[PDB]
């Protein structure tokens, strides 16, 4: 997105402290627990019957790493999100049939996980910066829907 330089620096400095596989498993797990209709894409992943089962499911973990690794790589291209994510947008529309509202839900869950992980370091201005980023990523993933 259009972040000012100090917002970009805020985003990048925090992300440097993130364990992507850990936070990715946590964010996807919490998406599936907090908004359980999102489980509809994941019937192949096995036991999603309790929050403990979801959070400890190795295939949820593994998909979370994959999703957040692609998010992470997008942070290097904040000036060109639509371009970075165009092929994935097409994929999610034409083959995976994922309603883009799911990307907005994931973004909000990710912001909650970052707040949980970083505590007082996740200040109101740093949150505002991350809210612009997760909105821009959702928008970019939704852009080739038709």
């Amino acid at each position: 997105v259009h972040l000012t330089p100090e917002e970009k620096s805020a985003v990048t400095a925090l992300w440097g402290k993130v364990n992507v596989d850990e936070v990715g498993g946590e964010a996807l797990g919490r998406l599936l627990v907090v908004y359980p209709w999102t489980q509809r894409f994941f019937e192949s992943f096995g036991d999603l019957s309790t929050p403990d089962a979801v959070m400890g499911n190795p295939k949820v973990k593994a998909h979370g790493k994959k999703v957040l690794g692609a998010f992470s790589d997008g942070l290097a291209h904040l000036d060109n999100l639509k371009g970075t994510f165009a092929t994935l947008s097409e994929l999610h529309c034409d083959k995976l049939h994922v309603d883009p509202e799911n990307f907005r839900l994931l973004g909000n869950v990710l912001v909650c996980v970052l707040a949980h992980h970083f505590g007082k370091e996740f200040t109101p201005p740093v949150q505002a910066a991350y809210q612009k980023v997760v909105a821009g990523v959702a928008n970019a993933l939704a852009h080739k829907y038709h």
Binding site: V34, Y35, P36, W37, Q39, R40, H97, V98, E101, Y145
Partner: protein
């Protein structure tokens, strides 16, 4: 949250709909798929072209459910319980989409009911479809 005037308005409008309710449900779906293409992600197994019998068949099911809700307007949670279970536990349609179909049903009714779709009836129909949407998403979590 439906007042007696709202209930009166909804039963009057839907009674004019009458035996066209299925045609109108199909048109509302078509309006939705063209206006709000993300809704097509729930129907990848359908032919969504204009005239599709799958869309027509589904529009009749949706319309019949709404006919049942009007008839049970004071006991909608029970009359719609199996459909709330179906949408919460199997179909798992994101709740935002119910606003989109509701708007397209109102546009369809507006295009077909010149005389009946007064400002007050429009308000009552919008409240009724919000209440239907609320019941249908009530068991999601």
């Amino acid at each position: 949250v439906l007042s007696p005037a709202d209930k009166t308005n909804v039963k009057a409008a839907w009674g004019k709909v009458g035996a066209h309710a299925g045609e109108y449900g199909a048109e509302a779906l078509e309006r939705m798929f063209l206006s709000f293409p993300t809704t097509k992600t729930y129907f990848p197994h359908f032919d969504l072209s204009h005239g599709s019998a799958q869309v027509k068949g589904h529009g009749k099911k949706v319309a019949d459910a709404l006919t049942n809700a009007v008839a049970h307007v004071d006991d909608m949670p029970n009359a719609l319980s199996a459909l709330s279970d179906l949408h919460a536990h199997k179909l798992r349609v994101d709740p935002v989409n119910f606003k989109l179909l509701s708007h397209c049903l109102l546009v369809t009714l507006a295009a077909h009911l010149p005389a009946e779709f007064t400002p007050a009836v429009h308000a009552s129909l919008d409240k009724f479809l919000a209440s239907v949407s609320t019941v249908l998403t009530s068991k999601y979590r």
